[PDB]
Amino acid sequence: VTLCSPTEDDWPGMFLLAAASFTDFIGPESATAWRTLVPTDGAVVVRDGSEVVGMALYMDLRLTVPGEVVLPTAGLSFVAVAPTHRRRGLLRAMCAELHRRIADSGYPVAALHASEGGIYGRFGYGPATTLHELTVDRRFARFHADAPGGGLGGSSVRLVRPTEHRGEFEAIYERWRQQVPGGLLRPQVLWDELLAEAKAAPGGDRESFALLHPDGYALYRVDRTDLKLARVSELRAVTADAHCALWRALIGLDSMERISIITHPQDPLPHLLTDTRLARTTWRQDGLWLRIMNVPAALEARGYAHEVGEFSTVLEVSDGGRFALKIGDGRARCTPTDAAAEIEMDRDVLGSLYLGAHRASTLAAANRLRTKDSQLLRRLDAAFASDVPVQTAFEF
Amino acid sequence: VTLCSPTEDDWPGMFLLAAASFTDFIGPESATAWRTLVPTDGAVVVRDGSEVVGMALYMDLRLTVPGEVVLPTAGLSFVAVAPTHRRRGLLRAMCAELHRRIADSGYPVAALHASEGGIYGRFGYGPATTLHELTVDRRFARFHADAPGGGLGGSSVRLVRPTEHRGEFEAIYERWRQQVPGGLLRPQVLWDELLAEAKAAPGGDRESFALLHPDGYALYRVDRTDLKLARVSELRAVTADAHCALWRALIGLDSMERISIITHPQDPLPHLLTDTRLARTTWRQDGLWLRIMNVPAALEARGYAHEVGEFSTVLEVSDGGRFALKIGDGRARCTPTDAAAEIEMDRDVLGSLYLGAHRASTLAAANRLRTKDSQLLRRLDAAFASDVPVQTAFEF
Amino acid sequence: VTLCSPTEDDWPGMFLLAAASFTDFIGPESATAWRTLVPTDGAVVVRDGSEVVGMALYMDLRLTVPGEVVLPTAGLSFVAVAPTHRRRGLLRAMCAELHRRIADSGYPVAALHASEGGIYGRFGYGPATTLHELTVDRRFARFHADAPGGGLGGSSVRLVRPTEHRGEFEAIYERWRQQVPGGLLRPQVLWDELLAEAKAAPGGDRESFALLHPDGYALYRVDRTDLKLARVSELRAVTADAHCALWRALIGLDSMERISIITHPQDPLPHLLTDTRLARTTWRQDGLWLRIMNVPAALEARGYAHEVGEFSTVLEVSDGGRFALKIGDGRARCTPTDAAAEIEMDRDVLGSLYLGAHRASTLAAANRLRTKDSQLLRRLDAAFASDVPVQTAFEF
Amino acid sequence: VTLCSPTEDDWPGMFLLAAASFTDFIGPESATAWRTLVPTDGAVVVRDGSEVVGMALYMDLRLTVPGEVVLPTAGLSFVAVAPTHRRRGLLRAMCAELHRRIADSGYPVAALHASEGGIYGRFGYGPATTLHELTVDRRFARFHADAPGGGLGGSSVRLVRPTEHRGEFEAIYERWRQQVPGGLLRPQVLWDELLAEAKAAPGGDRESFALLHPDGYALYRVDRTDLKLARVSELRAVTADAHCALWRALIGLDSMERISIITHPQDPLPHLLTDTRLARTTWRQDGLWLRIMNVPAALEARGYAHEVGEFSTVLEVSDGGRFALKIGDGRARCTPTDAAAEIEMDRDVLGSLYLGAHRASTLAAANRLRTKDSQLLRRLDAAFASDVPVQTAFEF
Numbered sequence A, B, C, D: 001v002t003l004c005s006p007t008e009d010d011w012p013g014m015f016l017l018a019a020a021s022f023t024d025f026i027g028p029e030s031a032t033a034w035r036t037l038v039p040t041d042g043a044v045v046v047r048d049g050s051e052v053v054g055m056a057l058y059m060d061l062r063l064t065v066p067g068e069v070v071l072p073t074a075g076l077s078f079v080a081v082a083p084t085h086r087r088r089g090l091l092r093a094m095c096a097e098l099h100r101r102i103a104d105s106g107y108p109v110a111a112l113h114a115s116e117g118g119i120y121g122r123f124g125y126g127p128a129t130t131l132h133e134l135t136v137d138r139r140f141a142r143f144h145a146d147a148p149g150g151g152l153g154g155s156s157v158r159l160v161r162p163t164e165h166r167g168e169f170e171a172i173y174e175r176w177r178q179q180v181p182g183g184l185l186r187p188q189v190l191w192d193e194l195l196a197e198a199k200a201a202p203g204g205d206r207e208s209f210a211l212l213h214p215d216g217y218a219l220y221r222v223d224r225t226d227l228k229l230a231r232v233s234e235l236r237a238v239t240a241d242a243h244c245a246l247w248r249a250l251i252g253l254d255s256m257e258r259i260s261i262i263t264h265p266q267d268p269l270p271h272l273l274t275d276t277r278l279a280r281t282t283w284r285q286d287g288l289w290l291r292i293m294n295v296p297a298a299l300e301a302r303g304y305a306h307e308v309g310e311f312s313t314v315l316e317v318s319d320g321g322r323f324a325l326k327i328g329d330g331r332a333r334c335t336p337t338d339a340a341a342e343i344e345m346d347r348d349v350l351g352s353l354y355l356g357a358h359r360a361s362t363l364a365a366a367n368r369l370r371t372k373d374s375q376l377l378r379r380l381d382a383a384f385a386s387d388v389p390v391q392t393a394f395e396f
Ligand SMILES: CC[C@H]1CCc2c(sc3nc(SCC(=O)NCCN4CCCCC4)nc(N)c23)C1
Pocket: A022, A024, A025, A026, A030, A031, A032, A034, A035, A038, A077, A078, A079, A113, A395, A396
């Protein structure tokens, strides 16, 4: 078994391994669109002796982090080991080589969506966003007297066909992704793919519709089998007014019993209703995972909470360096030191803290983060907290 | 229809209305235990002309709030309107009279557990704690290398019969409830009731067992019908070591497929495992609801985050007064003013903020909390945040 | 109503009756492939007065029986009576005529797959093979220290596209079918049909993949609706090493929870695992049914167990003749006699014994087989037993 | 942690561990009955330092093996490790000590029912009987013309109350258990327990009824929740006539849709019906597990098939000795040798072969049994086969 960058001859074998490894796999046509985001040396394959028995690659992404800072991000994807070649160290070998290439190329962070929760921790990935499914029984849903957009006169929201308003969705999404931690740039090829998935398929998904506001949109479709459930695939709102107006329109889908959405834990939807309990959490999972590739570059790049006073500490990342960390006026300075560590954690833990989805105090209670100073823990919690709640952009 | 404090003659009619209104009702014997917590003028009844068609009462409780401060709390309970007397304003009349008595008696806060989510908002109750059910597939659960209590030698945890270790459970609970916001004092009569529910009932619940550590306990029983599910009714851990040791023992229930617990959103359990996804959120609901009875008394009583710098604002509670609010060095001063309001919210919203379970920013995004100052919003978020995560003590 | 061999004009009416009688019916295109196996006078139709109200046919098959002996076999199929013409003796009339043609043509045995278990016994068919569905929870599956193909180095098994390795599947199947009782010759037209079913259908089955070893293959696909279940349509292994290697690869389908296969009761799979209970029997049914057309020809053709000493008896088949049966050195001699019968059974019972799937002792306990000699019963059990376990080839 | 025979002081701690380890546990009253079968030194406990954290014992049983031979059998039971003391080698230590005591006491075999399939193999237990659940849709069930007891006149079977016919059940069971491999002696205390379980329990099982024939009985009760399902707990038939007569009566339960029974793979029931498919296999599991304690004593004690000619081989049991094995005229002679092994297997494999439930050929195909001689394999298969099908007596 040898590990190499694939030649054009290797890709049929890679698409066979893909078809056999991923059930949700669209054929090589969607593969062509996504492949445009893979840089020249972004892919590795393992050959037996000879066929493709292992593969992994990364895509060039742009990830928004707290303080509206956009980082170049290596998006790991298309990771598969043939069922014939398990327990042979192929995943470890492929991840070691890609991380080498990612670090050398100058990416401060890598990111992925995990097929399983137990795999990627050991390679330094921490779950960094939380997917929160809300299911609304819209038959009972009444808007609170305080909820915006209740007054008389016309609606700001239009029911439209997605394909006829591409320019407007693109512009709204572009504003959203720059404002929200977890936001990703969505290139033209991924808009091509999204709007192609919007049409009905024979014995497949039903037609997608859009609700369009000047400052937000919702993409939804009736479920394949449950004809009383509308699934919102995507809601991007740049203003509170847009978010409320779009939910008034969704609750107006009078032929549905239930509206479901995969959102974030701080979605204000429940607070828009007279009965907060009607927006039920039906599912919760890790979304985006982060591997901090360069600790000082990552920690210096993001913004920190202004509310917490200037403080200095010494952070050790397990096999990731030891740093003098000074946080004040919403900025961090992170420099090499051999001074005694005040805080220790594995690389994955820093990934989990980085977008503010997990509290240092919570990780400390599980001993994933070690300090003897409870004051320092409070200061880290406050500093790493995100003003704008972290959301998940799109799966890759 | 007249509204009065019940005479001893009224209680048979109240127990009939109870039996017909609450499915989970134990007969008048458990009623006698709980009745010891109802003060002399703590109950109201509505009589038709004559039978009992409405009732409501409060119990004398002690509630822990951020800063380990214990408040006298009126626990509303046993609220019922006969199905014959709906839409007659009986609930509004009974709640108005009890709130009068509660306020006059000098309680700064009232609290309840809501049968429905859409009722109590309009009477000034806000959901203040969050119930989070975790279900662990213990067949896959492996403890992280970092998790405490992994080393060789004896176990700190004992499998015991609850009734034989009452003194130890009482002492552990008493330490827990004083340390954790949401904590309630559990009087002797409620320990009597808890340990009586621990025994098996013919065609009812199975026998309860306890896992006992010097600094924590877990009460659990096998589910009635699902014989591969253990339900943890209660886990009180005063230390991280106790919490981890108890979960090692629960994951050691080798005859079970699943362990479930109703816990809080910041439960560190998922972070103790190599696969965080194995601790699945299977249910989420409002726990304790709070009505702030005296705004200045409540706001001055709790502790605030030390990390946020001193700031001053003007808070208006809708029909609850307007106050100059100054927060610094973890303390609030809250005095009357006619100065222009910088922040406005209904009374229920303040209840939701008060134990730190809901962010001011989230409530602001739904327009439940109104300000023009985004800096002030960040400062409120930070100040009202609880260092120790808010938990739910016991339902009443 | 008249009974005749169909003219080319009759086939549209036969395909309509087929469409209305068989839900799993592919249109006339697959019908054309299978029709090549129907001999010139292999079909009967019943016409009302006039439309097709009844049909039945047989195909020319080659069936492997104990001792690796291959018998010409009439495979009954496409049997239907119009719902308008039930309880009119059409099935009895069509089966009588086909059995006449089959016997006169010189077939020693007829075979079918039964739509229902209660129909074919009365026409002399006995269930002769047993379908055994095993479902493996592959998340727990660990191979026993004794299981072959555990050592270090490369895998003998390749993940491939079925259509690209037709020649290899054909050659492996051809070796398997000649070695295993129940084996059937699979002609080129049925390989055409199998490899056409291997591709995904819109709103239909998912793509089929193959695991290929020099001495075995497995064809599998992810279930339509249960995306955590892989269904093995076919596993043909000529060696124990091939069988184990293919199951190691199937247990390596890490994205699946469950692997299911329709196999035989003696499948060694459970014994390859540390926990035999993980290979759960989820379904059990009659597979191939046999009608012995010529008792002496059938009994003389198959091999018998060498372990049992030479013995002689007199077998009466109900309306099928009486025979002096001498079994020794693994061979039978079966000659006409009027000597007193020592063993009596209906024709269907002999079909059930013939491939070794059912014990004479078991049939005797239900009085389907009558003797007064318990020693003779032990000798029949031993003699008719198959060294190589009976398997089911493909449904027809 | 120390390992000792329990003192009378230890038993409360053992009953607590029992209650917490076994859901199907009846309290100490049934425990007293079963405890009469535990010999003086039949129990071990592990104490921490001090409480009971581990226990295991054996009961004195009598097991019928092929040739109607009755062996003294150590029935392992009540095996539990506290959830606080997992992965501490307590099971290995307790099993090592009990096996020492069992071997020294002169038991040729040990037996158990396994809570899980993956535990007991490594301690030398092989699954030796197969539980086969048949569910009959009795609404369609018609008896075959050949089935016994179809003729006119009175029924041989009586519907009775179990408690009123104890003497008759005892005598029928005693005949059955001496005739059938897997049969166990059922002492008076276990008849006391069985007839106490026959009565209805409030919110528990429904009343048991009996069908009584001179040569067989069936004990059945309507399911707790499925009121159209009758569960046969036990059917013991000494004759084919009794078996058929009892099933005619069970199929006469006209208020039921379904009759279910946990039986053996060779149950002739399906062959009694015109539609064999109506007796559906709904569940299949290992029943009794055997550990051969003394290889020569066990192999010399059982009877072998008379049909197979005399043969000699050399059997090695992994860490269980090497023996010259000569089988002829239905008897084995098994003597020590250092001659080259012709057959090798682990101790557990011999347990699986011993009652004839598993074929040597099947175990060989999984490499659990190793020989280079296919003729020797055929001879072992034939010799170890049981004339009378192996059944499961009662769980312990
Ligand atoms: C040849 C270059 C690669 C780049 C990744 C890639 C494709 S198709 C494609 N489609 C998608 S669909 C969006 C999604 O929900 N992805 C999660 C699951 N994912 C795993 C692997 C791919 C299939 C689904 N995503 C890709 N990364 C890709 C081809």
